[PDB]
A paper describes a structure:
Type IV IRESs form a homogenous class of viral RNAs, which completely dispense with the requirement for any IFs and thus are able to directly recruit and assemble a translating 80S ribosome by themselves. As a result, two stem loops (SL-IV and SL-V) are exposed and are responsible for the bulk of interactions with the small ribosomal subunit. PKI is an independent domain of the type IV IRESs that mimics a tRNA anticodon stem-loop interacting with a codon.
A final subset of 54,561 particles produced a homogenous map with an overall resolution of 3.8 Å; however, as previously noted, many CrPV-[name] elements have a lower local resolution because they are more dynamic. Careful analysis of the local resolution also showed a high degree of flexibility in regions of the [name] not directly involved in interactions with the 40S, such as L1.1 and L1.2. With this conformation of the head, PKI is able to bind well to the decoding center, allowing for a detailed analysis of its contacts. Briefly, the conserved adenines 1753 and 1754 (1492 and 1493 in E. coli) project outwards from helix 44 (h44) to interact through A-minor motifs with the nucleotides forming base pairs (BP) 1 and 2 of the codon/anticodon minihelix. We also observed an additional base pair between position 1 of the first translated codon and the ribosomal base C1273 (C1054 in E. coli; termed BP4, Figure 1B,D and E). In standard decoding, this ribosomal base interacts with the anticodon nucleotide of BP3, whereas here a rotation of the base about its glycosidic bond allows for a tight stacking interaction with one of the CrPV-[name] bases, redirecting C1273 towards the first base of the first coding codon of the CrPV RNA.
Author numbering:
A (entry chain a): 1 to 100
B (entry chain b): 1 to 82
C (entry chain R), G (entry chain W): 2 to 130
D (entry chain V): 1 to 87
E (entry chain A): 2 to 207
F (entry chain X): 1 to 97
H (entry chain C): 39 to 255
Amino acid sequence: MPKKRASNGRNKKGRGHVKPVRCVNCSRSVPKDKAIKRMAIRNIVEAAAIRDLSEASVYAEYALPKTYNKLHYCISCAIHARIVRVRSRTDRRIRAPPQR
Amino acid sequence: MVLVQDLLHPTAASEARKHKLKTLVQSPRSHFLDVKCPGCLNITTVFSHAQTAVTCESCSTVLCTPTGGKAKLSEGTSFRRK
Amino acid sequence: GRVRTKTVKRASKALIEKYYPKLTMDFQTNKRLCDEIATIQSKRLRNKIAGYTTHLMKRIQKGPVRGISFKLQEEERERKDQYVPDVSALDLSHSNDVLNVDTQTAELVNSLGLKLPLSVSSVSAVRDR
Amino acid sequence: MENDKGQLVELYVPRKCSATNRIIKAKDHSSVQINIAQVDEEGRAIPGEYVTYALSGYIRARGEADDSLNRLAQQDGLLKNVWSYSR
Amino acid sequence: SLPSTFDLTSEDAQLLLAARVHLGAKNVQVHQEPYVYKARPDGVNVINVGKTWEKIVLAARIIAAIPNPEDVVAISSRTYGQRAVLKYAAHTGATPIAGRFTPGSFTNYITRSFKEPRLVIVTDPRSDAQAIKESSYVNIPVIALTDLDSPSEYVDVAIPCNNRGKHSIGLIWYLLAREVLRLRGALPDRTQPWAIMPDLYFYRNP
Amino acid sequence: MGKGKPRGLNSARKLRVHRRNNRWAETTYKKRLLGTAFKSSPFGGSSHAKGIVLEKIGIESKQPNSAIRKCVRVQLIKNGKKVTAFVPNDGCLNFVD
Amino acid sequence: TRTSVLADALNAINNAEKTGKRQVLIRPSSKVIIKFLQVMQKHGYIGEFEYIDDHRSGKIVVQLNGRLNKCGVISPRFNVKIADVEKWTANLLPARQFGYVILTTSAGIMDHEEAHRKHVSGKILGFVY
Amino acid sequence: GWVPVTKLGRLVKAGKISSIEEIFLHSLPVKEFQIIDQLLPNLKDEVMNIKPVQKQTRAGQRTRFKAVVVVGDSNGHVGLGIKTAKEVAGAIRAGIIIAKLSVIPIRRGYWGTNLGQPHSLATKTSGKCGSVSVRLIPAPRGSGIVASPAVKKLMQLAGVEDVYTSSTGSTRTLENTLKAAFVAIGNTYGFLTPNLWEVQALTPSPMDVYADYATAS
RNA sequence: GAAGAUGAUCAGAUACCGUCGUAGUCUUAACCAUAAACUAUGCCGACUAGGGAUCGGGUGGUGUUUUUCUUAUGACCCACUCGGCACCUUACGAGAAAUCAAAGUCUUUGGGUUCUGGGGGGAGUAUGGUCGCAAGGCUGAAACUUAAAGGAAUUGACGGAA
Ligand SMILES: [Mg+2]
Ligand SMILES: [Mg+2]
Ligand SMILES: [Mg+2]
Ligand SMILES: [Mg+2]
Ligand SMILES: [Mg+2]
Ligand SMILES: [Mg+2]
Ligand SMILES: [Mg+2]
Ligand SMILES: [Mg+2]
Ligand SMILES: [Mg+2]
Ligand SMILES: [Zn+2]
Ligand SMILES: [Zn+2]
């Protein structure tokens, strides 16, 4: 079997063997490089519920803060649902952040 | 840089750019800055990369602090070149 | 799915290339012309071709198209190209003053020519991208 | 090459590139003959008289080819100020 | 060898400057190009003008040296210079290619637009690249209008010029045409701005 | 890359040693050396051997072609070992007895 | 370490030739190297070459003619017993006719033909075809 | 039924290009096939092998036939043509055509001493294709074509009378081997000798000179 | 959370899933000496093609800002400089090809060295050595067997992949 990638787990190059991180969904030990680190910056309130909250609330403007979860996914787990998105051989080379 | 460089005589700019080693002939670009202290009227032939707390000929004035490369000339001190 | 077929389209194009004049917008006339011209065995096919031709004509009447630029069209283009709306003046003369060239540019000029009209800019390199 | 007493054997005696010397092969599909017309006083490019240059294909592929051509021209006397000796 | 007559006319130089043929190139810069004349600071390179002129002259000479005129295949994909190319073609009878090049034009002897040049001319070897490649399959010289970030692979006689574009490419084309005319043609003199105009060329208002 | 082997002008003994070492990967060579033919190989590393027909045995063939291959269980005279010899052509086994 | 300086130089030259350079810069610049260069020049494989005096070891520049094809160096300086010379030539050189096998010997650093003429062989250095 | 496309073809038809030597000199492409025939009437076309070759399909397989053809004479020209088509004869024809198009000259040199006419290669030349390196070492006289059968045949076609080979890697990939051999042959003209140190004039091409006769009216 | 209990599911399932959970996991004193200890790329050396960045040094910029007035440190900007954990094209160099700026300068075969491999299995076994508290390690066969074992990719077919 040939190399699919040059990088593979990616960040580990000239880095012996790094420390690991546990996945969110599976709790599989994944190296913090072969990791898939999506950043969930959700607002603390639900989109439609925001209005309701406003109606309820005291004060003006309000905090209306955002919850911050840097989620780590065990590759396989990510592939089941998450940002992964199985590419073509030629399309794998592209590292640019998608959409946008 | 391609095919026909004609390598004996470069433009001096190129030489300046390249490493003090990686030209035609080895030749350093460190200089004997002839420093004068504010105190006594006497000239110290201070090599620009001192590696030492450079005192004067006798008086404890402190001329140059040896930074890793070229020395910072301590306080308002005056100097000639080479 | 009333997508007029490829062959028909091709035929229409050919017709247009051949006989741009003698293809007046309206349909029956166009059909007749087609009949006179090309050896269409069918009737329906012929009709389709005529329709396509008419459509093409209509399109032309609102400006030109790709794959349809035969003779008359070229002439129309060509004339315009020859006698452009521009140029009054030269143009690209020394209309306003005597050329806002850079310092470097000026130097180059000096190196090359002897006496040229110049207006030496400051050359602000400027911060950020 | 030269059998017995002259008698030049081996035809197809090849075009050798101006820049490299490198032999231009029979199927060197990339190699090129540039023809530069001979100049005369006040306009005039003298019909049917050239400085002909051959460029090998390797050079062209590299992109060191244009520069080489320029150099050649300079050497000949078809240019001034273009190709310097030192860079 | 040379006539020592054509030393770049002052007017011509001025025109070039106006065009900003020589304020192009930017930060980006190719190791195969010593047509620069001092780097203007922060995202700029200034192009040597005399050298460019010389190159143009050489190109013109080369063109002249081709005997059969309907032969010098001019090319342009990118929109700014197509018009210029067309104009050039009109001036000096040599079937051009504005817009799409068609692959298998110089190879592939069945194609409707099967040209067979003995001298190719290009604007942007970054874009028309394909054309250059095609030419390289079948032994043709290539003239091209290099910005200092454009590749010069399978390129000869690379006229240096600003390929930000707009005025500059067109101007260059015009100059080339003029040169060609001078070297065997109607125009017998380097002087006189003459009945033509640069502004016949250039990109048009859509 | 100098490519493994020492290219020195006085590196000859080492080279020889290396070659010798390698020789023990080559199978035929190994066989020749150790006397596998002389120690095993029913025959005594010989072309032929006379042997006594202990019994006629039909052996079922490998695969693709399916048949019984009329072999003989032979006991070699010189060593005393027991082997199985195929018997060629039509019949032949009858002749052998 | 920098082993066989000469060899390195030769390699560099070869590389240059492959590239299509017109000239080479060589660092160490030995006596042997110089001799080799001279031999090459004599044969007709090399233009000018010039020894820079880095007030030190040396530093050569060689003008390549575009004539060199390979400029090889055989590794340990094998001891050649006159008859073996032929064998060596067969091994290295294309054709009985042309090319050389630069070998040092009592008389000096010379090609194979020269050595034969002399009636004097020795240890090989390199070759040129 | 002649009629040429290609300026070169037109020129040939006219009768101002005498032999293929000129073409070789100006490395002119020969996309048309008939030109070669016109030039060289002595083309012996020999089919080397034909592999059947199968793409695999939802139902069955697509049998085609990779016919290898070698073309020559005894002057010092060879062509190698490979084509894979379904009709066998057609495929063969195509291969032949390809070979003709290719047809490439060979520098035939002297074993050792000039004496007679040359019928070995000049220098030790080699080629490569996949994992086949065909190395052709020049022989002495009468010593024959010491080669793999296909290789030998190719040599014969070329007009090389005596030569040594050293075909290494997987020679039984016959087509590949042939290709390698061809490459090696080509490399003969390309290997610079001291015979060709002397500078040549650079002649004007027929395409430049006879430019009015070439091209359509 | 190997062991073990235990709750479902299936023709069954001491298997997942599920719940719990000794040994450990973690540590401290001894060993052991093995790994997909993998960049599945030995080391040293040289040379060959562009590009930007990026870390650590170090030069030059009447550059900018800091502001305690000139500042002087600091921190950038830009150019070059040497340095390790990193893209695109053509490859003429390579390579079976994926690919490779080295896996290049190799039938145009030789810069300097160490180590390893020689169809697959039998077998990392048998045996002996040796090393260990052990588990195991290093070392390491043959008999016998067999026409393929592999690699890379191509088209298919297929997939509780998208
Ligand atoms: Mg896989
Ligand atoms: Mg494996
Ligand atoms: Mg490190
Ligand atoms: Mg590690
Ligand atoms: Mg069966
Ligand atoms: Mg559990
Ligand atoms: Mg249960
Ligand atoms: Mg084995
Ligand atoms: Mg596989
Ligand atoms: Zn997971
Ligand atoms: Zn004092």
